[PDB]
Design a protein around this ligand. Structure first.
Ligand SMILES: [Cl-]
Ligand SMILES: [Mg+2]
Ligand code: NA
Ligand code: NA
Length: 331
DNA sequence: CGGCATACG
DNA sequence: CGTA
DNA sequence: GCCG
């Protein structure tokens, strides 16, 4: 009754097993901090299965037969059901390693490998890093300067104001080009920690060279606090944008992506997420259908041909999957 | 046991 | 290495 | 950590 891949089942944004899923996602995150990608995936998948259930798990009996629940994930759920807390999860939560790796990897420009190296060098706090700035990249310096603002979520209200300023720059850069909101806000989130926009043009080829033109226009409007070509071909830009606030402003992470209209359904699918949904969809494609999926296309390696898609609905049909709207992709 | 998504900056 |  |  519960399929094994997250892309085979609807997963809504809010659900009936929030506490259980949050505990499993702590263990997934801790596995990632140790480089244990397989265990991270299992705990993420187990959490996602709970998100897809139609009602709360109340007894360990109800996990029998669910995919991705074995002895370890079942023991976590059993302790939460019996005692309201899981000793392993709480030990992770309070550990110095978990807390510091979480703080460091939240910095824009810092991943697990960098965070782990700093941890081993004895660093523990953001002010430790600020006192050692020669050990920081341009990107990391921006991430650290803006960390407080970037730690506070954006509202959907804020997103609509940002989309209008992006649309203005895009319209000057290339009349007729369009801007589509992707990411978590397209999945229905009311708030979130960055904003993602996908840009295209209805005439294939007209989007070539577009993103530099858009970024220079936003930069001239004074709206870009950081981007990687500020000193200046590219198709993805990971920026920090000035967002107006009552009497002031705040820094917000914004990603801009350009795709040709022939690739737009694939890019829309990929950039809408969730991350686990897309990993599961690509795994399903390759392992169950023998087709290779990415954010540009869907390749048949036996015929050496790419599928044409005019919509996300086309892509789900190609893969033999029931269509899921973005709000049911919250694996 | 092997496998675990797949790109771009 | 970072980013999504 | 779990699946096939
Ligand atoms: Cl692992
Ligand atoms: Mg996002
Ligand atoms: Na980071
Ligand atoms: Na093994």
């Amino acid at each position: 009754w519960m399929p094994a891949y997250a892309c085979q089942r609807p997963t809504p944004l809010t659900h009936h097993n929030t506490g259980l899923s949050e505990a499993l996602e702590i263990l997934a995150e801790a596995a990632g901090f140790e480089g244990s990608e397989g265990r991270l995936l299992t705990f993420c998948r187990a959490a996602s299965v709970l998100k897809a259930l139609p009602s709360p798990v109340t007894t360990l009996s109800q996990l029998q037969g669910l995919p991705h629940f074995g002895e370890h994930s079942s023991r976590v759920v059993q302790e939460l059901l019996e005692h309201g807390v899981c000793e392993e999860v709480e030990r992770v939560r309070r550990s110095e390693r978990y807390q510091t790796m979480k703080l460091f990897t939240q910095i824009f420009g810092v991943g697990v490998k960098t965070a782990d190296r700093w941890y081993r060098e004895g660093l523990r706090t953001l002010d430790d890093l600020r006192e050692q700035p020669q050990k920081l990249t341009q990107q990391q310096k921006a991430g650290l300067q803006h960390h407080q603002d970037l730690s506070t979520p954006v509202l959907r209200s804020d997103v609509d104001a940002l989309q209008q300023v992006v649309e203005e720059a895009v319209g000057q850069a290339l009349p007729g080009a369009t801007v589509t909101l992707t990411g978590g806000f397209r999945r229905g989130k009311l708030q979130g920690h960055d904003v993602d926009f996908l840009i295209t043009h209805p005439k294939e080829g007209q989007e070539a060279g577009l993103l530099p033109r858009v970024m220079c226009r936003l930069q001239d409007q004074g709206l870009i606090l950081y981007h990687q070509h500020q000193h200046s071909a590219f198709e993805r830009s990971f920026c920090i944008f000035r967002l107006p606030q009552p009497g002031s402003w705040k820094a917000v992470r914004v990603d801009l992506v350009v795709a040709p209209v022939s690739q737009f359904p694939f890019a829309l699918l990929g950039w809408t997420g969730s991350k686990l949904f897309q990993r599961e969809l690509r795994r399903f494609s390759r392992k169950e259908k023998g087709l290779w999926l990415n954010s540009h296309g869907l390749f048949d390696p036996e015929q050496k041909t790419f599928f044409q898609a005019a919509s996300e609905e086309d892509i789900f049909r190609h893969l033999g999957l029931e269509y899921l709207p973005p709000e049911q992709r919250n694996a």
